[PDB]
Scaffold this active site. Structure first.
Site, short mmCIF file in Angstrom:
data_model
loop_
_atom_site.label_atom_id
_atom_site.label_comp_id
_atom_site.label_asym_id
_atom_site.label_seq_id
_atom_site.Cartn_x
_atom_site.Cartn_y
_atom_site.Cartn_z
N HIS A 133 0.81 -1.21 0.00
CA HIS A 133 0.00 0.00 0.00
C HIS A 133 0.85 1.27 0.00
O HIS A 133 0.32 2.37 -0.20
CB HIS A 133 -0.92 0.02 1.24
N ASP A 171 -2.41 -10.89 -1.96
CA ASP A 171 -3.05 -10.27 -0.81
C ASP A 171 -4.50 -9.94 -1.17
O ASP A 171 -4.83 -9.66 -2.32
CB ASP A 171 -2.27 -9.00 -0.42
N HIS A 173 -6.20 -7.43 -0.51
CA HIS A 173 -6.36 -6.01 -0.84
C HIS A 173 -5.54 -5.63 -2.07
O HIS A 173 -4.48 -6.20 -2.34
CB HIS A 173 -5.94 -5.14 0.34
N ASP A 264 -4.34 -12.76 3.79
CA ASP A 264 -5.62 -12.31 4.31
C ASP A 264 -6.81 -12.70 3.42
O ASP A 264 -7.95 -12.42 3.79
CB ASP A 264 -5.64 -10.78 4.58
N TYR A 304 -3.96 -11.94 8.83
CA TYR A 304 -4.16 -11.56 10.23
C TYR A 304 -4.73 -12.64 11.14
O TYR A 304 -4.84 -12.41 12.35
CB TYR A 304 -5.05 -10.30 10.28
O1 LIG Z 1 -2.52 -4.30 4.88
C1 LIG Z 1 -3.64 -4.65 5.10
N1 LIG Z 1 -4.04 -6.02 4.87
O2 LIG Z 1 -3.10 -6.93 4.39
C2 LIG Z 1 -4.71 -3.71 5.63
C3 LIG Z 1 -4.56 -2.33 5.61
C4 LIG Z 1 -5.57 -1.54 6.12
F1 LIG Z 1 -5.46 -0.18 6.12
C5 LIG Z 1 -6.71 -2.10 6.65
C6 LIG Z 1 -6.85 -3.48 6.66
F2 LIG Z 1 -7.98 -4.05 7.18
C7 LIG Z 1 -5.85 -4.28 6.16
K LIG Z 2 -3.84 -8.14 -4.18
ZN LIG Z 3 -4.15 -7.11 2.82
#
Ligand SMILES: O=C(NO)c1cc(F)cc(F)c1
Ligand SMILES: [K+]
Ligand SMILES: [Zn+2]
Ligand SMILES: [K+]
Length: 354
Positions: A133, A171, A173, A264, A304
């Protein structure tokens, strides 16, 4: 035929001083390491030492402003730490955070170097805080510096500037920072699978949709596979690899594969809401080892549920060590087929294998 492994307990020192139970826990990495011991995988790997990234290395992807601000947090009092962290989207900072981010990146540089010099065939990096991120100019989403993006540029810096690097980001996200850093680049192919929900899922940007295919020279070298409509698992991920990830990656012909390996999307995760199994992650790993003459570096991002991430990453290491893939256990969810067909409409113009 050697698999490398990097892990350093110093990366546990990054912590949340307001919320000892924040899910990005120090024990994420010790739990994964411990499970490698229990399964007797550790003695089968060559240990690669951690090191600090240098400031010049960080500048391969990040601005001097951003480097300087995170570096300065090492000496901030709690008041300024809480204040600085609250300025970013979803960041906590301790006085150890900068050092741990440097170790996470330098650990991956050493791993990439070990692969590219032929000292190991492939490697796993058990590191935190995560990276995908993080943007050129700002921290975000538990991430300070973009470890995977830096590792791609580091790899190019020690081989040739145009070395073809594939980053597969599984991931749950979207890796907004990795996409942005390489969005105009044809030497680094970014492929992300992620829960999207029409933009409502973190990081909450339509940059994650399937129609973002890259800019300029990079047109065609950004592949977003966005999931909509609830639970996704092994069938959906295997379908996406079959129809999209592997045909594209084989045509790109990478010289190095980096996995932004968040866990995750795993069954049991408190944040992802998906149900990818450890056997599922093993099959994704095994498929990627068919690329780049096996030169694969698996980099921990998110994930997580401590039991889930420990079982899932250990199964990936077992695959890198050459163990046979486990057996899998359903028809695809409708919306998954919708997502895959949208990506084919976005990327068939660019890939003759589509
Ligand atoms: O890095 C993350 N997940 O791998 C993550 C980052 C965030 F701001 C919120 C979340 F629920 C997860
Ligand atoms: K991803
Ligand atoms: Zn993530
Ligand atoms: K790209």
């Amino acid at each position: 035929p050697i698999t490398g492994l990097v892990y350093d307990q110093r990366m546990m020192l990054h912590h949340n001083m307001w919320d000892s139970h924040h899910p990005e826990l120090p024990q994420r990495i010790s739990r994964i390491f411990s499970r490698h011991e229990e399964l007797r995988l550790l003695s089968r790997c060559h240990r690669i030492p951690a090191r600090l990234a240098t400031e010049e290395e960080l500048a391969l992807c990040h601005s001097s402003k951003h480097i300087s601000i995170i570096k300065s947090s090492e000496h901030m009092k709690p008041r300024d730490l809480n204040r600085l962290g609250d300025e970013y989207n979803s960041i906590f900072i301790s006085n150890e955070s900068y050092t741990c981010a440097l170790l996470a990146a330098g650990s991956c540089f050493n791993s990439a170097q070990a692969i590219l010099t032929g000292q190991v065939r492939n490697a796993v990096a058990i590191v935190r805080p995560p990276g995908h991120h993080a943007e050129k100019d700002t921290a975000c989403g538990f991430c300070f510096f973009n470890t995977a993006a830096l590792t791609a540029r580091y790899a190019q810096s020690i081989t040739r500037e145009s070395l073809r690097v594939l980053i597969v980001d599984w991931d749950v996200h979207h890796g907004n920072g990795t996409q942005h850093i390489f969005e105009e680049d044809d030497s680094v192919l970014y492929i992300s699978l992620h829960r999207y929900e029409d933009g409502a899922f973190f990081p909450n940007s339509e940059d994650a949709n399937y129609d973002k295919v890259g800019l300029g020279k990079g047109r065609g070298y950004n592949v977003n596979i966005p999931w909509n409509g609830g639970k996704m698992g092994d069938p959906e991920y295997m379908a996406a690899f079959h129809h999209l990830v592997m045909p594209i990656a084989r045509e790109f012909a990478p010289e190095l594969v980096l996995v932004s390996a968040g866990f995750d999307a795993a069954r049991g995760d408190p944040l992802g809401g998906f149900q990818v199994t450890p056997e599922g992650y093993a099959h994704l790993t095994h498929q990627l080892m068919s690329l780049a003459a096996g030169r694969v570096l698996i980099i921990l991002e998110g994930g997580y549920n401590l039991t889930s991430i420990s079982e899932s990453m250990s199964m990936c290491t077992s695959m890198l060590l050459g163990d046979s893939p486990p057996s899998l256990d359903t028809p695809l969810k409708t919306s998954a087929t919708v997502s895959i067909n949208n990506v084919l409409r976005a990327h068939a113009p660019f890939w003759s294998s589509l």
